[PDB]
Design an enzyme around this catalytic site. Structure first.
Site, PDB file in Angstrom:
ATOM      1  N   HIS A 190       0.858  -1.142   0.000  1.00 53.28           N
ATOM      2  CA  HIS A 190       0.000   0.000   0.000  1.00 53.28           C
ATOM      3  C   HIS A 190       0.919   1.224   0.000  1.00 53.28           C
ATOM      4  CE1 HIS A 190      -2.783   3.127   1.867  1.00 53.28           C
ATOM      5  NE2 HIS A 190      -3.606   2.510   0.872  1.00 53.28           N
ATOM      6  N   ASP A 216      -5.017  15.179  -1.905  1.00 54.60           N
ATOM      7  CA  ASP A 216      -4.019  14.265  -1.317  1.00 54.60           C
ATOM      8  C   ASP A 216      -2.686  14.973  -1.290  1.00 54.60           C
ATOM      9  OD1 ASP A 216      -2.782  11.777  -0.418  1.00 54.60           O
ATOM     10  OD2 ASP A 216      -3.781  10.650  -1.991  1.00 54.60           O
ATOM     11  N   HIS A 234      -7.786  12.203   0.835  1.00 52.04           N
ATOM     12  CA  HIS A 234      -7.051  10.943   0.975  1.00 52.04           C
ATOM     13  C   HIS A 234      -5.676  11.147   1.617  1.00 52.04           C
ATOM     14  CE1 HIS A 234      -5.168   7.289  -1.089  1.00 52.04           C
ATOM     15  NE2 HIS A 234      -6.247   6.809  -0.488  1.00 52.04           N
ATOM     16  N   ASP A 273       3.093  -0.427   4.505  1.00 48.82           N
ATOM     17  CA  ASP A 273       3.060   1.035   4.344  1.00 48.82           C
ATOM     18  C   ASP A 273       4.402   1.710   4.708  1.00 48.82           C
ATOM     19  OD1 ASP A 273       0.633   2.125   3.183  1.00 48.82           O
ATOM     20  OD2 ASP A 273      -0.447   1.153   4.891  1.00 48.82           O
TER      21      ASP A 273
HETATM   22  O1  WO5 Z   1      -6.052   1.544  -0.218  1.00 46.55           O
HETATM   23  W1  WO5 Z   1      -5.376   3.526   0.116  1.00 46.55           W
HETATM   24  O2  WO5 Z   1      -4.874   5.235   1.190  1.00 46.55           O
HETATM   25  O3  WO5 Z   1      -4.364   3.656  -1.529  1.00 46.55           O
HETATM   26  O4  WO5 Z   1      -6.360   2.856   1.843  1.00 46.55           O
HETATM   27  O5  WO5 Z   1      -7.089   4.272  -0.659  1.00 46.55           O
END
Ligand code: WO5
Length: 493
Positions: A159, A191, A427, A452
């Site tokens: 992610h 974002d 986001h 992450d």
């Molecule tokens: O899956 W991600 O910040 O890329 O949770 O929308």
């Protein structure tokens, strides 16, 4: 210390994940936020960057993001290392990558390139498309492209959204390279990434080697990994270590903690850790009795996911004020627990001591991908309940919360929605404290068990630029949706 916030965070990480220091988290000095001479805050790669305009006509953010992608790649002399969430980069994101690679090839350079995506035929098709678009420049490039899943049952896969060039420059944040959500739309997602250079770019390179080392190990297991390479090239588990200096050059005076997580299915525990957490109790986070809760009830999970603890420690370090900008604070249950108990307890501890907390999340009307709650009450109720444990009851909890909280949904102009009628989607994975120290990366504050990565930067100068360019314009427009706002005496929760 000049760096009280990093000092605290670092002391926590060393107890949580000592065996991962260097690879999954790392403190460095001597970095630089990589902004231009003309607009020194434009290390802050926000998108779209069209504050005040419900039509988003002049997207100075988007333009700078794509240009910086191209510029960093075009300066490559050895390696380009990219991670994101599937789908693979498209539209003008892909164009920026292609243009950069052609520019580097024209300057005479031979490059190794890795592109890794997490996901729930694709890789070989993406390799072939890129190869076609590169033309003669492809003769200069050793390419690896892969999709990976580390755990089907924990929904764990990459992610992180990282672009590292020569182990020297790094762009990271919340931005997926998805043209439809970010670019070719009159309701673009809001974002942010940051751009830096220095040793902290090396840290990202070592994080990516950690992921690629697992990926290459599992490259013959189709359920786990789909891998494609140019020509007769093998999988490159350690491109960074093998190609770039361990001793990455210094570029400025900025201290940084790089921090990530390994999710579930790569490594189950840090065998060097002797971390012994106090695991909070009794909440209503686990909607169903059967769910295994990695966020709140799995000590071993913390030791291979130092980022969760790093973000909770960043909150705990605040002396004055905390600003949080997220898609959500809460997750959809099942399959995840609704919230991180220790995070809400840390926010409650701060408000009880008079430290101000601002949380801005995405409009629930998005639901409605980009929201996981029906109402802001889902945040305020939880904070209030956790405050009740330490202020002696519900009444004293509500008073503490109303005297110290700003809670709202995001807007970027005077209008409640974009001019095209669609709600604003946000986001960011952003936390700033004390106009001093901030996190920008891919790790959401809501429960999530993915791989992450992000940076924690302690620089009051940069934090002030973040205020002027992002957090101040955000609050200017977003404050009209607040259910709680201590600064104007609003307490509707
Ligand atoms: O899956 W991600 O910040 O890329 O949770 O929308």
């Amino acid at each position: 210390s000049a760096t009280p916030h990093l000092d605290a965070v670092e002391q926590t990480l060393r107890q949580v994940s000592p065996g991962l220091e260097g690879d999954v988290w790392e403190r460095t000095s001597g970095n630089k936020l990589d902004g231009s001479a003309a607009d020194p805050s434009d290390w802050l790669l926000q998108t779209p960057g069209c504050w005040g305009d419900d039509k988003c006509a002049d997207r100075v953010g988007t333009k700078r993001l794509l240009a910086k992608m191209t510029e960093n790649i075009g300066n490559a002399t050895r390696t380009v290392d990219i991670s994101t969430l599937a789908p693979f980069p498209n539209g003008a994101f892909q164009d920026a990558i292609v243009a950069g690679l052609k520019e580097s090839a024209a300057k005479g350079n031979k490059l190794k390139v890795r592109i890794l995506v997490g996901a729930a035929v694709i890789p070989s098709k993406y390799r072939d498309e890129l190869t076609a678009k590169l033309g003669k420049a492809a003769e200069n490039i050793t390419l690896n492209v892969a999709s990976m899943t580390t755990s089907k049952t924990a929904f764990s896969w990459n992610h992180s959204k990282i672009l590292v060039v020569d182990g020297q420059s790094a762009l990271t944040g919340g931005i997926n390279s998805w043209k439809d959500d970010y670019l070719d739309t009159t309701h673009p997602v809001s974002d942010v990434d940051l751009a830096l250079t220095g040793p902290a770019a090396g840290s990202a390179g070592r994080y990516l080697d950690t992921l690629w080392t697992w990926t290459c190990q599992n490259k013959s297991n189709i359920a786990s990994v789909w891998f494609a390479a140019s020509g007769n090239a093998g999988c490159m588990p350690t491109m960074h270590k093998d190609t770039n200096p361990k001793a990455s050059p210094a570029t400025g005076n900025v201290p940084v903690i790089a921090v990530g997580g390994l999710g579930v299915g790569i490594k189950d525990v840090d065998p060097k850790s002797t971390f012994r957490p106090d695991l909070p109790t009794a909440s209503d986070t686990k909607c169903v009795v059967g769910l295994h809760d990695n966020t709140n009830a799995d000590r071993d999970y913390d030791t291979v996911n130092p980022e969760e603890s790093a973000l909770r420690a960043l909150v705990a370090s605040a002396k004055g004020h905390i600003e949080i900008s997220q898609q959500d604070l809460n997750a959809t249950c099942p399959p995840l627990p609704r919230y991180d108990i220790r995070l809400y307890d840390a926010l409650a501890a701060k408000m009880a001591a008079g430290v101000k907390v601002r949380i801005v999340v995405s409009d629930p009307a998005n639901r409605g991908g980009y929201s996981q709650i029906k109402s802001l009450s889902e945040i305020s109720d939880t904070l209030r309940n956790r405050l009740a444990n330490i202020t002696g009851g519900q009444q004293a909890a509500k008073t503490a919360m109303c005297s110290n909280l700003q809670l709202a949904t995001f807007r970027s102009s005077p209008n409640g929605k974009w001019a095209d009628g669609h709600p604003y989607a946000q986001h960011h994975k952003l936390v700033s404290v004390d106009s001093s120290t901030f996190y920008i990366g891919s790790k959401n504050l809501y429960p999530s068990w993915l791989q992450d990565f992000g940076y924690i930067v302690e620089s009051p100068e940069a934090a002030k630029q973040l205020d002027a360019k992002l957090l101040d314009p955000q609050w200017k427009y977003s404050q009209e949706t607040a259910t709680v706002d201590y600064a104007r005496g609003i307490c509707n929760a």
